[PDB]
Design a protein around this ligand. Structure first.
Ligand code: WMO
Ligand code: WMO
Ligand code: ZN
Length: 257
C-alpha cells in the first residue's frame, strides 16, 4: 500500500489516488513575498479550553492524538473560516535529520517537523461527510524547529515508547493541546488538500508564521517510532512528509502586514 519509501512514496501515489495531480494539492511552498495581506480575514479563534483528548495511536504513517469530537469542546473559528470547525486529532510529520521534515516550506526553507491540528466543519455533522465537501476541513499547521524543549510536548514524547509499532494505541486523556502553540497566531492561508492518501481536496490550510521550538531529544524520540507492525522488520518512522506541490491557480493570503 502507500508509504514514504522509494517504491510506495509520494511519486507513486497518483497511480491509486489520481487527485495527487489535482488543482489544489498540499503541501505548498509559501513564498512570503508573493503572499498578500488580506484585510477581509476575521480574527482567528483557537478555543481549546474544553478539549478532551482520548487516545494516541501509531497508524503506520504517523501517530495521532485523537479527541472527543461529539460536542463543540475544542474548536477553530474566524480567520478565513465560515462557522465552526471541531478538533478531531493532531499528528506530526518529521525528518531523519533536523534540516528536513516539514511539509509546507517557507521561501523554500524546510523545518525539522510540522504539527497538524485537524478540524472538521460542524455544518456537515461528522468527519466522514466533511471529507466529501470542498470546505469540509481546516488544518492548523505549526512548524517545529530544534532548539529549546517544548514543555507542552513532553507528555506526548513520554508515551511514544508504548506505541512503537503500527496499530498500537494507548490511553491519552487530559492532554492540553494549547501547550503546542506558539505565542503568535499570525498565519498564511490557502485552499488545499490532505497531504496523505486519499489526498482529498477539502482543506482550508492555516499555517502559523511563528515556529515552536522543541529539543533535539524530543525529536529523536519521534524518530525511534516504527512504520512497521510488531514482529516485522524494523523501518524507522522518519521522513513521513510529502514535498511541496504546484501552487497552480491559488493565492496565499497572510493575516498580518
Ligand atoms: C503490498 O506489497 C507492495 C506492493 N505494492 C506496491 O508496491 C504499491 C506501491 C504504490 C502504491 S500507491 N502509492 O499508488 O498507492 C500502492 C502499492
Ligand atoms: C479520509 O481520509 C482518511 C483518513 N485521513 C485523515 O484523516 C487525514 C487527516 C489529515 C491529514 S493532513 N496530513 O493533511 O493533516 C491527512 C489525512
Ligand atoms: Zn499531516
Amino acid at each position: 500500500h502507500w508509504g514514504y519509501g522509494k517504491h510506495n512514496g509520494p511519486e507513486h501515489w497518483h497511480k491509486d489516488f489520481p487527485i495527487a495531480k489535482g488543482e489544489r494539492q498540499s503541501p505548498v511552498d509559501i513564498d512570503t513575498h508573493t503572499a498578500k495581506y488580506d484585510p477581509s480575514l476575521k480574527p482567528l479563534s483557537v478555543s481549546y479550553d474544553q478539549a478532551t483528548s482520548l487516545r494516541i495511536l501509531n497508524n503506520g504513517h504517523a501517530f495521532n492524538v485523537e479527541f472527543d469530537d461529539s460536542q463543540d469542546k475544542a474548536v477553530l473559528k474566524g480567520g478565513p473560516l465560515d462557522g465552526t470547525y471541531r478538533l478531531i486529532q493532531f499528528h506530526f510529520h518529521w525528518g531523519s535529520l533536523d534540516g528536513q521534515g516539514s511539509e509546507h516550506t517557507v521561501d523554500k526553507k524546510k523545518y525539522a517537523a510540522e504539527l497538524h491540528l485537524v478540524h472538521w466543519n460542524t455544518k456537515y455533522g461528522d468527519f466522514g461527510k466533511a471529507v466529501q465537501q470542498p470546505d469540509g476541513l481546516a488544518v492548523l499547521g505549526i512548524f517545529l524547529k530544534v532548539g529549546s524543549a517544548k514543555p507542552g510536548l513532553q507528555k506526548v514524547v513520554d508515551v511514544l515508547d508504548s506505541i512503537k509499532t503500527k496499530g498500537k494505541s494507548a490511553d491519552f486523556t487530559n492532554f492540553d493541546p494549547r501547550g503546542l502553540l506558539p505565542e503568535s497566531l499570525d498565519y498564511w492561508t490557502y485552499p488545499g488538500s490532505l497531504t496523505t492518501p486519499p489526498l482529498l481536496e477539502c482543506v482550508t490550510w492555516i499555517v502559523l508564521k511563528e515556529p515552536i521550538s522543541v529539543s533535539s531529544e524530543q525529536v529523536l524520540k519521534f524518530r525511534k517510532l516504527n512504520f512497521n507492525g510488531e514482529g516485522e522488520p524494523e523501518e524507522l518512522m522518519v521522513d513521513n512528509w510529502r514535498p511541496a506541490q504546484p501552487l497552480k491557480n491559488r493565492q496565499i493570503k497572510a493575516s498580518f502586514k
